[PDB]
Symmetry: D2
Subunit: 172 residues, 4 copies
C-alpha cells in the first residue's frame, strides 16, 4: 500500500514473440516422445503464461494446475493435481523464479510420483535473487533485480490483467 | 474414448474478435463502479478464456480461481484465495450448459455478500438447461454439439487448442 | 507467546459424563428417522469431541470433516466434505462457539446442498461473546468468558491433547 | 455393499489398554527430545485413534491432520496446517496394509526435513505388504480379516463403533 507507478519492461509484442519461440523449443524436445505429456501450472500467477504457451506447444498434451506456497516455512500443497503424472513427460510452468525455494520443493514433490521426465519452464528469471541451485530447462526472460508486475504477476493482488510486463516504481 | 477426429468450429480469429467485444461490454458495465472488482474463473476449463478476457477488460480488477466438484453435491475442491465481500464479482466459465454447477457456485459466492454478482461464459448451450441461472455475458450460443478446445477437454485432450473444435466420431 | 498457566475448568470425568448425556439426547432425536445420518466435524479443534460423541451416538451414521476459516474476512472452505449430505440428517460438531460468525456461515453453506435436516452440536458455548443469532440444538457446557484450552482446543497450537478443559491464566 | 453382520473382534476395553501402553512407549521415546513434537493423523480413518492416543502421550505436542488420495498417484487433498521442519513427527494411521499410501506420505513429509519421522498404526496386516515401510509403533497385528470400527469404515458405515468388529458376509 505504497504510492507508486508502473513502467513497461517487456512489451506485449516482445512476450508473444518470445513465447512463440519457447513453443518451438518445447515442441522440438517432446515431439518424438512416445509417452503422454502434461503441462503443470503453478497457481495463481501462471494462468496467463500457461494459456499462451500451451497454444504454442504443438504436441498433444494435458493441462493441469497445482497451488503451493511457503520466516522460513514449509512448502505445502493447497491444491494438488487433478490427474496422475506417473510415466508422463511433465513440464512445470511458472511465472517467475526469484529465490528458487518454492519451485525446488515442488519439483521434489512431483518427482516422487515418478514421471518419465521432469522439466521447468518459467517466463521470467531473476538470477540475482537465486538462493537454491534449481535446473530450469526453458526461460523466457532473464530480468534485472526489479519488482515486476503484469501477465498474471501481481503487486498486492493488483495488475495481473496487464498484457505486458511492467516494473513497480516507488515515489516520494 | 472412441475413434474420432477434430475439425475447426470457431477459429481463433473469431474467438479473439468476440472476446474483444466482451471486454468492451464488461468495461462499460463496471467502469463507474468505484468498488473493487474481481474475475473468478472455474478451473480447469476456464483458464485460457480468463487469460484472454481479463486482458480485454480495461478496469482495475483482481483475478481469482476456484475448483468445484464435477445428481451429486457441488463441493469445493479449492476455494478462492481472496475475499469478495463488497466487491463486484464476475464469474468466468468456459461453457454454461445444464446450469447445475454454475447455479450452486453462484449461491455459495452470494453468501459472502459481494456488491454485485454476474456470470460470463464463452459458450452457451440453451437446450441442455435444467436450472435457470442468469448469465449476463455470453460469447457464443451453440447447438448441442460435442465441442473441444480453448480449455475444454475430451478425456483430458485438446485443452490447448487455440480454437473451438468439433469432435467427429467414427 | 506470553507467560501463563493452565487451570482446570471442566474435569475429564465431567466431560465424559456430559458427552454420554449428549449421546442419549442425539440418539433419541434421530433414532426414528428413515434417512441416513452424518456427523460433520469442523477441523481442527473438534476431532476429539467427535471421537467421543459419535461413540455415544447409538444411531447408524457416517463421520465426515470439513475445514473452514475466516479485519472481517469471508468464511472459505479449505477442505470440503468427502461425502454428499443431500437428503440426510446432518449434525455439525464443533468444539466451541464464540461469536457464532464461522458456524453461521458454515450452516448456510451446508444448507445449500439441501439435507433432510440440519443441526448443530457444540461442546462449549460462550454466550457472552455471541455476535450472531445462531440456533444450537445441543450444547455440552455454557462457559464463562474465559480463554479455554484442552480437548482439541488450542492456545498457540498448544494443549490440544489435554483430556480436560483448562483455562489459560496469564502471569505478571 | 452386501448382506452382512458385524461381531466384536477387539473390545474397547482391550483397545483402551493397548493404547495406554502405546502412550507409555511414545512418551518414553520422545520425552528427552527437547524439540517440538507433532502427531499427524491421516483422515478420515485415524481421527478416533488420534483422539485416544494423544491423550495417552505425556509429552507436549501439536496435533495436525492431512488427507491423502485413496496403481494411482498419492495426491494431497488437504495438507498440514502447521510446519514440521526441525520437529519430531509421528504419523498416526488406523491400519497399515499394503504399505503404499503410508510410504508415499512418509516420503512427502520427509522433504520438509523434520528432526525425526516415525509411524504409529493401530492395526497392521503384515501379509498384504507391497512396500516395506518401517513402522515403529503397532497396536495390533491381525490376519487378513475384513475389519471395521474405530474410524475404519465399510461403505461409509461403522466408523463410530467403539470396538474393532469383523464383517461377516452372508
Ligand atoms: O518481482 C516479483 N513480483 C511479484 N512476485 C514476486 C516477485 N519476485 C518474487 N516474487 C514472488 C514469487 N514467488 C511466488 C509468486 O508466485 C505466486 C504468485 P501469487 O499466488 O499471486 O502470490 C515465488 C518465487 P520462488 O520460486 O523463488 O520461491
Ligand atoms: O459439448 C461439451 N463438450 C465438453 N464438455 C461439455 C460439453 N457440454 C457440457 N460440457 C461440460 C459441462 N460442464 C463443464 C464444467 O467445466 C468444468 C471444467 P473441468 O474441470 O475440465 O471439468 C459443466 C456442465 P454445467 O455447468 O451445466 O453443470
Ligand atoms: O477460548 C478460546 N480458545 C481457543 N479458541 C477460541 C476461543 N474462543 C474462540 N476461539 C476461536 C474459535 N473459533 C475458531 C476455533 O476453531 C478452530 C480451532 P483451530 O483450527 O485449532 O484454530 C471459532 C469461534 P466462532 O464460531 O464464534 O467464529
Ligand atoms: O480389512 C480392511 N477393512 C477396511 N479397510 C481396509 C482393510 N484393509 C485395508 N483397508 C484399507 C487400507 N487403506 C486405508 C487407508 O485409510 C484411509 C482412511 P479413509 O479416508 O476412510 O479411506 C490403506 C491401505 P495402505 O496404507 O496399505 O495403502
Ligand atoms: Mg510462480
Ligand atoms: Mg466449465
Ligand atoms: Mg471450532
Ligand atoms: Mg488409514
Amino acid at each position: 500500500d505504497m504510492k507508486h507507478t508502473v513502467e513497461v519492461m517487456i512489451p506485449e509484442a516482445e512476450i508473444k514473440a518470445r513465447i512463440a519461440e519457447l513453443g518451438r523449443q518445447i515442441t522440438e524436445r517432446y515431439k518424438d516422445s512416445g509417452s503422454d505429456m502434461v503441462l503443470v501450472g503453478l497457481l495463481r500467477g501462471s494462468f496467463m503464461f500457461m494459456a499462451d504457451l500451451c497454444r504454442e506447444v504443438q504436441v498433444s498434451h494435458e493441462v493441469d494446475f497445482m497451488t503451493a506456497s511457503s520466516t522460513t516455512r514449509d512448502v505445502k500443497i493447497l491444491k494438488d493435481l487433478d490427474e496422475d503424472i506417473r510415466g508422463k513427460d511433465v513440464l512445470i510452468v511458472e511465472d517467475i523464479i526469484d529465490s528458487g525455494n518454492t519451485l525446488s520443493k515442488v519439483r521434489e514433490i512431483l518427482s516422487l510420483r515418478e514421471p518419465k521426465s521432469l522439466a521447468i519452464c518459467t517466463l521470467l528469471d531473476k538470477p540475482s535473487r537465486r538462493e537454491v541451485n534449481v535446473p530450469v530447462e526453458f526461460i523466457g526472460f532473464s530480468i534485472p533485480d526489479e519488482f515486476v508486475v503484469g501477465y498474471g504477476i501481481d503487486y498486492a493482488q493488483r495488475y495481473r490483467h496487464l498484457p505486458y510486463i511492467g516494473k513497480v516504481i516507488l515515489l516520494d
